[PDB]
Design a protein around this ligand. Structure first.
Ligand SMILES: Cc1ncc(C[n+]2csc(CCOP(=O)(O)OP(=O)(O)O)c2C)c(N)n1
Ligand SMILES: Cc1ncc(C[n+]2csc(CCOP(=O)(O)OP(=O)(O)O)c2C)c(N)n1
Ligand SMILES: [Ca+2]
Ligand SMILES: [Ca+2]
Lengths: 650, 650
């Protein structure tokens, strides 16, 4: 009973820290933390190896709160187990500048592994984390030197499992046989709209079994022995595991089993009743020293990490080259990058130039993983020397995501979050729309995921308007902390990859053609490193043609038509708006002189071009199913129209 | 033996029209049409009730080609059955201005029900087609008067079934019990990357059974009796059915069961080898009169439609008032609508004003269907008078989509395509990212879906940066054929709903606040009908503050702030860029006088504002977890910052 009592006291400490933090904030989600407190207790106190003094310990188990609304469950248990998350931060839940935002933010709170809140993201990203652990173990573990060994745990809600992305990621995790991915589903039969049976009556565990997962059930979350057994059963199984855990949202309160418990403070009445019902004599934010002593993980964390560091030292002696490579990759340190582009001797699509740059870069980047959402021969993402990842071949650095852009985005993010890898994946730019929430989450977390987008324009031709981007470029450019690089040619494409790989602050979208475009000079194209540059200057510029990607070549042909009529314009290549705006004002003004009329050319929406141009040759309608170059010309992309647009300003 | 010959002959005419059209285009996808010809034969010749003479017959069975790449399968069979699709259009497959674009485009080809090509869209949109038939049948059918009675057939590929949207949509179709939805999956074990077992080994039919679908197997697509069998089994069942149909991609060619058959022309050798293996003597685009006569559905089509026309007249006699409402709704005519807004007395969020507008509008609009992706209490999308749709209550006009924005998008499109309904659904503006391809597919098709998006800015407060839109407004405004209306207040919100309901050309996004904002004059707010208007003029304006939604109120505060220092600016409300752009230039230049310095104010990305403004008070970073008004103020939306930005111009 004193074991039981201390378990029950510690669990209620989790419940009441969450209840009282929501109440003081008058904002947040007390209901799921109230139900799931026992699981958070069990993971952080007994099951997981982790170090509250070093949240970045590379061999820690990873916990993902996919059900991010339940943030106070995680803050309470970080606080109680000795992470640097003081009580004062729990009393500033949801307040400006606090380490306790409404939804978990990786980088803002120690021990937060993934930014969650958008449902389906945590559970999907966790497939990446587990795939990262599996592949790094395969790469580095040696007989008697187990240097990579950790689990990926997830707490997911009904919402997570309704989102298509979680089903895409689950199909892949099962295909991949990721045995160390263990997901707990809070089966509490309640969602925001009320009872789940308004919208959600599928056989969830039957679906997960169809994906090749193990399913287990725990009939009462409050029964710690039933949770321990299910977890031990999960660790013996070669399949990823979903454990259905029945709970009562708002457990112990008069809002128990109600959607009203989901998303608003309990109120003083229901807080007083929960106190009485659960036998909690402690006032707000007071937890007795007994629980803190019981929950302190600082000493077990120190000992776990020290045992790992001692295992690393024996590794460094038995295998110094492996050890040095592991430490370099775990630190996120790139090796020296080539400064010389590949050799091009004829026109080539920027997708193929991209495949050529990867052939150069991959052999010198063992951390570099590639893939495609079933567009491998269309995206040029499988570098020479890369082989397919599979259960049978855990060392392959190439991932077949299938027709799953969204889960591809989430898995790339998890691969990039874990440490050890740098991952890119490919699809068509139009199908960036299938993965937007994963692109935004990489931007929010500052995760340098590289998104490769081919078939960037109407120039892709016959596949027609459902495949032809229009709004895509400006829709991505508007997103904070996303570089969008649209190389004009094979040479720009090489510099675009160096920019993307060296950018650690957030994601990069690489935007590439299907159709072949001419070469530029390798010396001129290095200007991509400044985001925008003068490609072809003239004496006493009367104006500027500014262009991106494929349209730079249209711009150069228009520069010749104007030069034949005695009008002198320079051509600026603007491969990246973001990298150009980061340049000194003096540089930006040298490139685009104040007072000179400017025409922009880009086969995409015009909205945003007024930032740089007085007139734009752009596409503000959907495309057409026709061959290139006819479709391009008849939708207005001719050098005669760029010229005419320039002559209208002078 | 001679029936059999005419079936084999008609099936091969479908294969060779597909092969030869792809060959002449030198572009497209011969492989899936080759395998699936038997199915196309059977649907269009025997199973389906359709009229080639009238593709708009409202009681026709609907066929959705979800696997849009296989467009020539549909084009061949529409041609063969006597649809208005001449041989000359097949000869112009994927050519400029042709009626045979590379992917099916609704309104460009007679008998094409949905624009497809983005995988997952057709199978998902089909759920809305089936939901509309089911509800219209419940609303209008009377004893001895079946005026609504038709099936929704889908052809889907592996790629459709890996896409998470198809899982979301299948979960809802099984929950809803949509028995007359019948999906055929081309189980050919090939995708673009090679064998499906590179990335796709789940038990698909076990997953579909977990959704509450019937699942059937046809071991050989060429066995027409097995197909007839499965379809009869589907029509007897009270569940949506998935029929796994095994086929060889590139059936009868040297490229059979190869990814090479997927997406390029067979080439001359493989064409010649296919004519031999299948014993097809006829040169390209030649089909024997024998087949045209067997496949001609014009007589049976007219007979089916006249029978329905007869039953409608009999309905008009028995049920004059129902018949009138049905015909009005089938034609998409609005009944008269209230002309004055709800009466408001206090500060109110535009989400609550939207709820008040729907309470006024819905009772006049029996066609109007509402919904939310599990945010019903947050989005104010359940009008007073609406009840939940469910299998037991097929008459409810309110749809609980659960946490499925993407399938909600597609289902709304299905409902709005079918005829008889106008459908809207709500989520938070940030979660438009989860449904973007269905938003784009509404804009491509010109389907007037109304997307309700609340929680439009950092002003939503504590839920933090994962919930707070930044890029979303401009990301949506860049998209062709989408109105984005961001009403300033309760009164603008009523006119926004009128604008959306009356716009039939394409979709409308209504963008609404979480937080209360003040009321404007009822009469002033009518200016929303012109997209942009002068809200508060002054004498001899020295400049303009232009603003949208909530920031209109910040702009009036900044106007008053500037007047207290002798500076006179007008305030323009720009609730819609697209409706303002559509006004005469003379109006636009009355609203924004050339020469006058313009400061814009919007709590979203700056990119795009240069089209209207010289300086923009905007947000180009992710938000923060803190209460409103503090979060809005500390991120730089103050009257002092707006005045400061105008004084840095004047
Ligand atoms: C993609 C996405 N759509 C919508 C929401 C809004 N939202 C937050 S919590 C939630 C669902 C709550 O139900 P459940 O996930 O079962 O949570 P519980 O209250 O049972 O923990 C919703 C719809 C979201 N967070 N993410
Ligand atoms: C959402 C989406 N992502 C990617 C594509 C590109 N694409 C077109 S067809 C296809 C898959 C082809 O495999 P499958 O669907 O099995 O077709 P099959 O060759 O068997 O007809 C792909 C990835 C697409 N059309 N839509
Ligand atoms: Ca729940
Ligand atoms: Ca296939």
């Amino acid at each position: 009973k004193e074991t039981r009592d201390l378990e029950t006291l510690s669990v209620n400490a989790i419940r009441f820290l969450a209840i009282d933090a929501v109440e003081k904030a008058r904002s947040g989600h007390p209901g799921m933390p109230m139900g799931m407190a026992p699981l958070a207790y069990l993971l952080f106190r007994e099951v997981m190896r982790h170090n509250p003094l070093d949240p970045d310990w590379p061999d820690r188990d990873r916990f993902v709160l996919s059900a991010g609304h339940g943030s106070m469950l995680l803050y309470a248990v970080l606080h109680l187990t000795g992470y640097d998350l003081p009580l004062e931060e729990l009393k500033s839940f949801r307040q400006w500048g606090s380490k306790t935002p409404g939804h978990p933010e990786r980088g803002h709170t120690p021990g937060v592994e993934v930014t969650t809140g958008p449902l389906g993201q945590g559970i999907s990203t966790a497939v990446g984390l587990a795939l990262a652990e599996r592949k790094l173990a395969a790469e580095f573990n040696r007989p008697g030197h187990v240097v990579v060994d950790h689990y990926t745990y997830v707490l997911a809600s009904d919402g997570d499992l309704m989102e298509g992305v979680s089903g895409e990621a689950a199909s892949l995790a099962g295909h991949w046989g990721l045995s160390k991915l263990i997901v707990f589903w809070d089966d509490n039969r309640i969602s925001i709209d009320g009872p789940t049976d308004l919208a959600f009556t599928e056989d969830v565990l039957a679906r997960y079994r169809a994906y090749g997962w193990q399913t287990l059930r725990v009939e009462d979350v409050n029964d710690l022995e039933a949770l321990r057994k299910a977890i031990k059963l999960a660790k013996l199984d070669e399949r990823p595991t979903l454990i259905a855990v029945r709970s009562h949202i708002g457990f112990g309160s008069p809002k128990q089993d109600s959607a009203k418990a989901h998303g608003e403070p309990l109120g003083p009445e229901a807080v007083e009743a929960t106190r009485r019902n659960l036998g909690w004599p402690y006032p707000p934010f007071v937890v007795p020293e007994e629980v803190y002593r019981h929950m302190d993980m600082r000493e077990k964390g120190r000992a776990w990490q020290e045992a790992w560091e001692k295992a690393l030292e024996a590794y460094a002696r038995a295998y110094p080259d492996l050890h040095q490579e592991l430490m370099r990759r775990l630190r996120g340190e790139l090796p020296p990058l080539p400064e010389e582009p590949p050799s091009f001797d004829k026109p080539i699509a920027t997708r193929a130039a991209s495949g050529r740059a990867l052939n150069l870069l991959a052999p010198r980047l063992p951390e570099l993983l590639g893939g495609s959402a079933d567009l491998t021969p269309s995206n040029n993402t499988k570098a020479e020397g890369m082989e397919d990842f599979s259960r049978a071949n855990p060392l392959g650095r190439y991932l077949h995501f299938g027709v799953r852009e969204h889960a591809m985005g989430a898995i790339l993010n998890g691969l990039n979050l874990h440490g050890g890898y740098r991952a890119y994946g490919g699809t068509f730019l139009v199908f960036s729309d299938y993965m937007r929430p994963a692109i935004r989450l990489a931007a929010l977390m500052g995760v340098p995921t590289v998104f490769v987008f081919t078939h960037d324009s109407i120039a892709l031709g016959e596949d027609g308007p459902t495949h032809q981007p229009v709004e895509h470029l400006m829709s991505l450019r508007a997103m904070p902390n996303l570089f969008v690089i649209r190389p004009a040619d094979a040479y720009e494409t090489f510099y675009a990859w160096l920019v993307a790989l060296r950018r650690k602050e957030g994601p990069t979208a690489l935007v590439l053609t299907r159709q072949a475009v001419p070469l530029l000079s390798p010396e001129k194209a290095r200007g991509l490193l400044r985001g925008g540059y003068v490609l072809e200057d003239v004496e006493e510029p009367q104006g500027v043609l500014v262009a991106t990607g494929s349209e730079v070549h249209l711009a150069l042909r228009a520069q010749a038509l104007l030069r034949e009529k005695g009008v002198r314009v320079r051509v600026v290549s603007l491969p990246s708006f973001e990298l150009f705006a980061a340049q000194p004002e003096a540089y930006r003004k040298e490139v685009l002189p104040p007072g000179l009329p400017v025409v922009a050319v880009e086969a995409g929406a015009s909205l945003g071009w007024e930032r740089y141009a007085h007139k734009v040759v752009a596409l503000d309608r959907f495309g057409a199913s026709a061959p290139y170059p006819e479709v391009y010309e008849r939708l207005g992309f001719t050098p005669e129209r760029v010229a005419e647009a320039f002559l209208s300003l002078v």
